[PDB]
Structure 1
Amino acid sequence: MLCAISGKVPRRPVLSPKSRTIFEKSLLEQYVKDTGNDPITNEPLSIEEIVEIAQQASLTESIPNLLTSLQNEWDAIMLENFKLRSTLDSLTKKLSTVMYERDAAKLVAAQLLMEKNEDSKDLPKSSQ
């Protein structure tokens, strides 16, 4: 029903046989030309291996197809992709704060495993 590269609804979907993932014909053939592999599972794939397999209701107000429709397709692509680049830099900052506090906690556990186990041993020593 969908494509596994762009996130579209393909009109001419193709199926690779090595990993069953439905993708668009121009999107699968483009990937096989650049790097000689299936992108999803990183297995070998060719153009001759793949197997070839929607109604779009036009608005009544269809100069709208030239001015108003064409700009926003390039507007919504840019300000989403620019928003995504802010997400990727922010998450690696949140990865660096995830990894630092993880090592900060394990040094507490490694320090408190030495504190409690010797104090309970000193409870076993005080009876003597």
Structure 2
Amino acid sequence: MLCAISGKVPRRPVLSPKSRTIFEKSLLEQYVKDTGNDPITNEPLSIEEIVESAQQASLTESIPNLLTSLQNEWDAIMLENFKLRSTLDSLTKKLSTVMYERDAAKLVAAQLLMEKNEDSKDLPKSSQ
């Protein structure tokens, strides 16, 4: 029901036979020419390998298509990807804080593994 590249609702969906995943024709045809392989599974795939109705009710107030609607579309594309670039940058920063704190904990455990068993060992030796 959607395309597995853009996040569309395809007008001419086409399925690849190597990995069962429906893409919109234009977007899958572009990928194969860029690099001849399936985008998801990274398996060999060509244009000939591919195997080929939706209603949108055009608003009552449908000038706006040139001015207001088209403007909003390129606003919504612009401010989303910019905000999405902001999200990717923080995930990598928050990655570094995760791995550092993880390795910090590893050293605590390693330090405490020597501490505990030797404290237990000392109790076993005390008896003697």
The TM tier, using the shorter chain, reads over 0.9
Percent of aligned positions that are identical: 99
- What CA distance in whole angstroms lies between the structure 2 residues aligned with 1:120 and 1:126? 10
Q: Secondary structure at the match of 1:51?
A: coil
- What CA distance in whole angstroms lies between the structure 2 residues aligned with 1:65 and 1:88? 33
Q: Secondary structure at the match of 1:14?
A: strand
1:54-65 equivalences under 5 Å are 54-65=54-65
1:39-91 CA-partner distances (Å, limit 9, x unpaired): 10000000000000910101000001110001110000000000000001111
RMSD of aligned alpha carbons: 1.0
Divergent runs of 4+, >4 A: none
Instruction: Name stretches of at least 5 consecutive residues in structure 1 with no aligned partner.
Output: none
Native 8 Å contact 2:32 2:46 kept in 1: yes
Aligned length: 128
Native 8 Å contact 1:32 1:45 kept in 2: yes
Q: What TM-score results when the alignment is normalised by the length of structure 1?
A: 0.99
- What CA distance in whole angstroms lies between the structure 2 residues aligned with 1:78 and 1:36? 29
Structure 2 CA distance for partners of 1:59 and 1:124, relative to 1, 3 Å: same
Native 8 Å contact 2:11 2:53 kept in 1: no
